[PDB]
């Protein structure tokens, strides 16, 4: 696009991964204001409007909130406390023809300072004196629509930097385009914490025997305790059983009678009691009361 017609395009109901922007190995002035770039893909924001121009690269340091200049005064202005990312990279190899790229025609003069996030489109010329222009260009006409000269013999400061603005505004609307969410594989039949699509909890994920209609997203039983969460990749229905807990009780015949005791781990399977308590962290005197010949359920 052009700088007189950089449209405020609404690209909605999509995703946009930025790790391919991270390992592109061509970025120059990747600047994210407001939020860090390391927490940009996992969490998103609403109003995901975007802009595009190939701006000349010698005053990208002027592109800042609370900083004026030439581009900030006449081409593109940022508001204070910007939430969003401005991205600049080298554009020497592909937008460079012989004799200069005379297609990115740009405005040099405007009567007032630009408001932030305003697309300025015009045809009429700059007014600076008192004598009006009669259509024929004269001594104070001052034609603002000047030319970028982008030759291949320019240096990296004079060669242009391609700008895209992923601005994040705050309006009463949900987000449309966000970054991706990485996901690992699933484990089965284990007391494991999980991160599903919205809900997290502790329990044992087992195979199920019931069925779902295609609109239930999770499940629950009587006294508001959940029983099933949808896994949205494999399309096989899993359940939850809470992994086991309980009290312990110690059976003794008296300290005057003998020194031996019997320990009661209640309502558990009697195979995972070295996995239940930390038998590797406790004493070897405790480690002989987790397994042995006299294991009874």
């Amino acid at each position: 696009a052009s700088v007189y017609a950089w449209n405020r395009k609404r690209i909605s109901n999509c995703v946009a991964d930025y790790s391919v922007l991270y390992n592109s190995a061509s970025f120059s002035t990747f600047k994210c204001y407001g939020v860090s770039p390391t927490k940009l893909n996992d969490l998103c924001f609403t109003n995901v409007y975007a802009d595009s121009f190939v701006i000349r690269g010698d005053e990208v340091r002027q592109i800042a909130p609370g900083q004026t200049g030439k581009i900030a005064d006449y081409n593109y202005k940022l508001p204070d406390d910007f939430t969003g990312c401005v991205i600049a990279w080298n554009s020497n190899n592909l937008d460079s023809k012989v004799g200069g790229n005379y297609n990115y025609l740009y405005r040099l003069f405007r009567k007032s300072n630009l408001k932030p996030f305003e697309r300025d489109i015009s045809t009429e010329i700059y007014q600076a004196g008192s004598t009006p222009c009669n259509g024929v260009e004269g001594f104070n006409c001052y034609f603002p629509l000047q030319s970028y000269g982008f030759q291949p013999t320019n240096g990296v400061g004079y060669q242009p930097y391609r700008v895209v603005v992923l601005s994040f505004e705050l309006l009463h609307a949900p987000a449309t385009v966000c970054g991706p969410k990485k996901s690992t594989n699933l484990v089965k039949n284990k007391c494991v914490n999980f991160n599903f699509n919205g809900l997290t909890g502790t329990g044992v994920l087992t195979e199920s025997n019931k069925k779902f209609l295609p609109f239930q997203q999770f499940g629950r039983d009587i006294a508001d305790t959940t029983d099933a969460v949808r896994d949205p990749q494999t399309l096989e229905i899993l359940d939850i059983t809470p992994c086991s807990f309980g009290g312990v009780s110690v059976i003794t015949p008296g300290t005057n009678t003998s020194n031996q005791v019997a320990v009661l781990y209640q309502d558990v399977n009697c195979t995972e009691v070295p996995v239940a308590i930390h038998a590797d962290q406790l004493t070897p005197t405790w480690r002989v009361y987790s397994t042995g010949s006299n294991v009874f359920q």
Partner: nanobody, 124 residues
Framework: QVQLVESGGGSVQAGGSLRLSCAAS????????LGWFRQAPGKEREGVAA????????YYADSVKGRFTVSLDNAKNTVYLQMNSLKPEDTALYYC??????????????????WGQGTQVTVS
């Protein structure tokens, strides 16, 4: 929240080697970009080396290209700057800067950096 302590300076004959290091303490995971600065006597402080912590990509200036290299050690949380084939125009004050807003090439003084205390590298 980011504190940088750098060392490894000294004096050496031209054609020798030196190795600078800059240790980072504080919010290590928020640091995204390490840049090495250099201010000659009678000159403005310019940029020499660049390093992205996430990607590992390196950028160098044209006067230090082919002679200077930069590396990162995530175990010690310390960036390294190894100097090979030194010339006596490199006598300057060296600075290490840590960035938490992303990566920006070339290096500029007016942007937000966590600045080091400055070290002296003298060659002749």
């Amino acid at each position: 929240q980011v504190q940088l302590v750098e060392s490894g300076g000294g004096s050496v004959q031209a054609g020798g080697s030196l190795r600078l290091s800059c240790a980072a303490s504080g919010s290590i995971s928020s640091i995204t970009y390490l840049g090495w600065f250099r201010q000659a006597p009678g000159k403005e402080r310019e940029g020499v080396a660049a390093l992205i912590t996430v990607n590992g990509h390196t950028y160098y200036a044209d006067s230090v290209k082919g002679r200077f290299t930069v590396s990162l050690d995530n175990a010690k949380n310390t960036v390294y700057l190894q100097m090979n084939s030194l010339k006596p125009e490199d006598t300057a004050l060296y600075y290490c800067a840590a960035a938490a807003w992303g990566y920006a090439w070339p290096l500029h003084q007016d942007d937000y950096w966590y600045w080091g205390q400055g070290t002296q590298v003298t060659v002749s």
